[PDB]
Structures are given as C-alpha cells and as structure tokens.
Amino acid sequence: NELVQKFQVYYLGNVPVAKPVGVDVINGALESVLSSSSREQWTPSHVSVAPATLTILHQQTEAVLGECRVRFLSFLAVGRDVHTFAFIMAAGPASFCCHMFWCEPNAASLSEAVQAACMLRYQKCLDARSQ
C-alpha cells in the first residue's frame, strides 16, 4: 500500500481555488481558512502517501477524510508560515480544490514525501508509455 508511515497533522480542510498553481493561491487559501477557524476546530489526522494516491484519515480511528490521485495533484507548497502545507487538486477538468494542513514541528517532512511521490509517479508514467 503506502510509501511511508502516515503523518500526524491537522487537516484544516479544503476550499475551491481559481488556479492549478501558485504560492499566492495557496497562501490566500491558508489565510482564509485560518481566519475562519480556531485550533480546537482543527481535525487531527494523518496523511498516507502511497505511489498513486494521498489519503487523509481521522486521527487514529482512521476514517477517510479525503483521497487524491497524484496524477490530478497540480501543485504543492509550504506556506509562508512553516507549519502550513497545501496542495491543489484538479477536482475535474476546470475545477480546482486546495487541501490544507498544520504540521508540527513544521511541514518539511510531509511536503517532501508528497513531492517525492510526484517525482516517482512521473518517472513511472514516462517509463510505462515508452514500452
């Protein structure tokens, strides 16, 4: 199944965004969601990074909060505040959705794991299509 062990983070939720890429887009989404929530409202959760999908699950009860195919993840970033992580999905052909997280001590290891999954997936796809 997974590539690494799940990440214990807070799921801040998801919001629609106008564009598939940009740190300005993800930081606008982060500011909006942080302004309309408090730390107690935050959903403790973990992110499972598998080869083809990212799955977000409720803290240790492990219900499914979201699932995302790497091929439809258009962009990811760490926010200006180093605890925040976001990725943008193409929910459909012209429809974008931004998923956001609070990470302790920071978002370094989640973002690395997600970036690595993207880079690995791209090579596996190029290689599949060249055979």
Binding site: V23, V70, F75, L76, A77, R80, E112, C118, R121
Partner: peptide, 27 residues
Amino acid sequence: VEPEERHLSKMQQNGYENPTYKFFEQM
C-alpha cells in the same frame, strides 16, 4: 544552512508543480 532548511525555503518561495499532472495534461 541545513538540507531540510534549504528545501523548505524552496518549498515556500516556489512550491512545486507536479509534472505527472502536466504529463497527462498534454495528452
């Protein structure tokens, strides 16, 4: 400056555009 630290600043200033997305996008 550390490896985690340098990759973080890059993650913050530029983020990362998934090439897997663009691969299937240009098809």
